[PDB]
Each structure stands twice: as C-alpha cells, then as structure tokens.
Homo-oligomer: A and B are copies of this chain.
Amino acid sequence: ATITGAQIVARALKQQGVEHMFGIVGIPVIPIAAAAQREGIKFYGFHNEQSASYAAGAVGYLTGRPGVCLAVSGPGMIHGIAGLANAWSNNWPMILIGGANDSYQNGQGAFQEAPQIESARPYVKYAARPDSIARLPFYVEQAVRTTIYGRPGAAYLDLPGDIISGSVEEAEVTYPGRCPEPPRTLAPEENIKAALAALKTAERPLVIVGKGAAYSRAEDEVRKFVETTGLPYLASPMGKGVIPDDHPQSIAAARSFALQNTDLVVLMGARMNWMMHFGQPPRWNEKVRVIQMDISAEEIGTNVPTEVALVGDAKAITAQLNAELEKNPWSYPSETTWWTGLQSKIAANAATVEPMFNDDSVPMGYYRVLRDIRDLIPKDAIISNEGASTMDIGRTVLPNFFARTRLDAATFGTMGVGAGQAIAAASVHPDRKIICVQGDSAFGFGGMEVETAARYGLNITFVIINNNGIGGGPDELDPAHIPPGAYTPQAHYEKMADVYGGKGYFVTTPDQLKPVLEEAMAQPKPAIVNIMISNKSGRKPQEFGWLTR
C-alpha cells in the first residue's frame, strides 16, 4: 500500500485539527484540495488567493487553530502573503501552503519558480520546505504547533510538486498525535497581589479589554473581574462583546475623556500601539501607570513603562486575579468624581448623536442607516465590518453581546478582508447569521467573493454603505479630472447578486431601510443591499483624530 504526498498532507492536517481550507487550485496543488475534501476538511475555492488568505487568519482567531490557505506556485503564493502579514500583525494562527516547482527543475527557470520561503519569511514564525515525502507529518505538526504555541502567528509550508505527486509506502510514514492546546501560563502570585494593590491606589482606574482576551477565551473570567471590582472598562474594537456592549460599566461613549484622564489602566490583552495612541500624550496623561496582561513578554513595556507585568494566558491570569479578590475582597466605589465625569461625557455624546440617528434627510447619513442595520442584527450574529467611516461608525453603533463576534480591519488596518472574514465566520459558525457591512471602496477589494459565499450556501448578507468613494466621491465625474479616490457615482454593486441568482437591492430613502433589510436577511442566497449615503456625512466630531502623529 502506497500513499502520495498530497494524501499524507491532507491526513496530517486533519489529524492536527485543521477543519477549514481556503484557496485556489492549479499546478501543483490540485491533489491536495482533492485529498483534503476526502479527509473531511472543508475546502473553499475563492476568486483570489488574497481574500482566501485573509479568511484563513480569521479562522485562527475564531477557533484557536490555524486556518489554512492553499495556493499554487509563484504568483499564487505571493497573493497569499497578504494573509501571512495580516496574521502576523494580529498574532493570529494561520498556515499558507504554497506549491513550488518540481525540485529537480530548480535553476532551470521552471514554471512559477520563485524564492517563496524568503518572500514569506518577514511575516512568519516558521517557514519550511519538507525534505522528503515520508517526513511530511513532522512538518505539518511542527507548523501547527508553532502557530498556536507562544504568541500565536503565521507559518508557511513550501511544497515542491514532486513531493506532492510522489508516493511512498504507507509503512514508511509516522503521524504525530494531535498537537494539544498549549498550557495556560500563570503569573507569580506576588505579581497578582501587586496588580490588585496598585489598583487600590488609583483615583481614576480604567480596564481595557482587547482581542487578546477574546482570543484566550477569557470572557467569563474578564466579566467576573470587571463586575467584582466595579471598574469602568473600555473595549477595543475587536474586544467588543467579551463583556456585552450594553454592560453598565462600559465607558465606550467617553473614550477620549477616559484615556486622557485615567491614572492607572489595566490592559487585558491589548497593546499600547497605534490603536491606543501609544499610551502617550496628548491622548493619555504623561504619568499614567500601567498593569499589562499579555502572553508575549517582549510586548511588556512598549512605548510606556509597565508598573506590574502579568505575563501568561489571559484566561488563567484573570482567574488568578479573581481568586485573589475572593481571598481579599475589594471593589471600586460606585459614587466617585471619576464615575460622575465619565457619566457626564457619556450623556453628552449620547445627546450629540441622537438627532443623527433620527435624521431622514436624503442623501442619508451614516447614523440613520446604521440605526436600522443595528435593530435587525440577531444578537448572536457575527458582524464583518470594513471601511473607513463605515467601520469606525459601525464600531460605535453596532453592539456585540458575545466574544469573537466582530471581525474588522484589525491591527493592520487592511482593506480586502471583509468578504473573506465573513466566509470564515460562516464556515466556523454554520448555525449563525453573518452580516457583512462594508464601505463601497472596501467592497470592491474582494467583491467577486459574493459568488463564493453563494456557491457554498453560506448565510451571509452583504450590506454596502456607498458614498461614491474612499471617504466619498462626487455625484458626477469630470473625465479630465477624476479624483483619485472616487468611483462611478451611484455604482450599482447590488447587480452583482444577479451573477449567482441572488437578490440585489438599491436603497436611497429611509422608508426603504427596514423592509429591504428584513427581506434581504431572509433570503436563501446572499443578498446585496447597496445603500447610498451623502458624501458629506461623517462621524460625530472629536477633539482628536484617530491617527495620532
């Protein structure tokens, strides 16, 4: 009995817990996709590997096991570097499997001969070309384990065509056991006590809940910690829903005030990177104190010093914090000048946006449109939200009630992830509704993948919030002077639903919003709802712009 390299790879992947594979077939990886389907891995054929490789990283975030992207040699693999870099930037587990030319044609100018390991290297924890067919399971298990152990990240496997198509006797192949979940590392008890003692000295304490806490599956421990301590908290964009967004201790609507004035912040799986304005003035106080909880020791003390470091797994360390609070109870008072100032700011920002939610002017505004989207999203739906103002106002208006239910442009700020992340969510969660809310520019980066969603019967509804460009475009184009970020005015993207026999809707007036969105979400194929908005509409005013520089 013999077996091919392709069949060994597919068996090993399934044994290691891979359940989802996204890519595009061609020389030399056709038999890998075929073998993956026979092993029961779900294979999705995309229209571009760029989108497929973003889907793979999203699987890693959602499941804690790497999604796999399968790409042909040369340009196929290079298209997939996009997803390597997005997983690198977000510390998400993901594997790109790239075919390569037959090894005995190296140097000859073989079909799609390319330095693929060197191209992947900057973005991966692990890059390997297996030396022989019979050792393939060694490399598969090592790749999988390296993506999920330590700080999670990306890996690249380089498979020459002759390793894929060649055969060995089955008896020559040893398969490792399934890589177990990594141990959930703990902080020293002295550091646990030091974190809690420091909290008790703060006049204006703040907890930030980030997507590291979501990735760790720490949501029960984090909610218990925040409720026991009574602390104000802020969710990062993909930390939304770790604690339900309607929780009374959320100060999301006073975010700028909270960061500017806190004297002590607890970072629960969140970085002091650009998203948090580096922890630095003018957005933070120059003397802010930091308790930092991260699996990555090297991240501790980036940009601003850390007073108490909690290095390890967020679920395990937050459980240590909760155990120590049970031993030595403490909570932050419910009546303080901090709470009063936070509540004043929340109420003022609520009053500012309320008229915008209720403005029926045409062309419509973001808040008016997102109001009706919000009121029709099931509470356990997964939201894929991508764009500039479409995503930023979507972040504030569309709540999440469960962890890991918002997928957006994330740390790398990537356009091109929307449909791929929606398809990943549908594959992981076949029983949920997926709502994809994209700006019109965002939609165009991967718009062909609406047919992919349709072909695999995925429960995704596509909503486009269209202002004619990248932050808007004019109503009529001057052919001699097309703005660099404009598109065809009133582009009818919803006609793309006719490609696969779905329903497309073109919305311009507020009386259309509720009936159209309700009907669209009920369709047995993915509907596309193309909603025109004013090119003057934008977010509620802020003292500071989001891009600190």
Contacts and interface: CB of A to CB of B under 8 A. Distances in A.
Contact of A79 (B82, B121, B305, B312): B82
B297 A183 contact: yes
A273 interface: yes
A102 interface: yes
**Main SS of chain A's interface residues?**
loop
Contact of A108 (B297, B303, B456): B303
A115 B120 CA distance: 12
Contacts of A122: 114-115, 118-119
A309 to B, nearest CB: 5
Given A26-B415, A45-B470, 6 more contacts: A48-B50, A48-B416, A102-B549, A104-B135, A185-B185, A185-B312
Contacts of A454: 488
List 10 A-B pairs, minimum CB-CB distance, nearest first. Answer: A109-B273, A47-B444, A33-B484, A495-B498, A149-B297, A103-B131, A150-B297, A75-B414, A186-B186, A111-B274
A66 B129 CA distance: 30
Given A25-B470, A414-B74, A492-B499, A486 B45 contact: yes
A186 B183 contact: no
A47 B447 contact: yes
A455 interface: yes
Contact of A274 (B108, B271, B278, B496): B108
A516 interface: no
Contacts of A413: 74-75, 111-112
A303 to B, nearest CB: 5
B444 A451 contact: yes
A112 B549 contact: no
A305 B175 CA distance: 11
Interface stretch (A356-364, A393-401, A475-483): A475-483
Interface in A108-141: 108-115, 118-119, 121-123, 125, 128, 131-132, 135, 138-139
21 contacts: A24-B415, A25-B484, A43-B484, A45-B470, A47-B447, A48-B444, A75-B82, A78-B85, A79-B416, A106-B128, A107-B128, A110-B273, A110-B274, A118-B122, A142-B302, A183-B297, A183-B311, A186-B312, A447-B447, A491-B500, A498-B498
A273 B456 CA distance: 39
Nearest to A546: B111
A309 B316 CA distance: 16
Interface string A286-314: 00000000001110111101000111100
A346 interface: no
A122 B124 CA distance: 12
A89 interface: yes
Contacts of A81: 78, 81, 119
A113 B123 CA distance: 12
B188 A188 contact: no
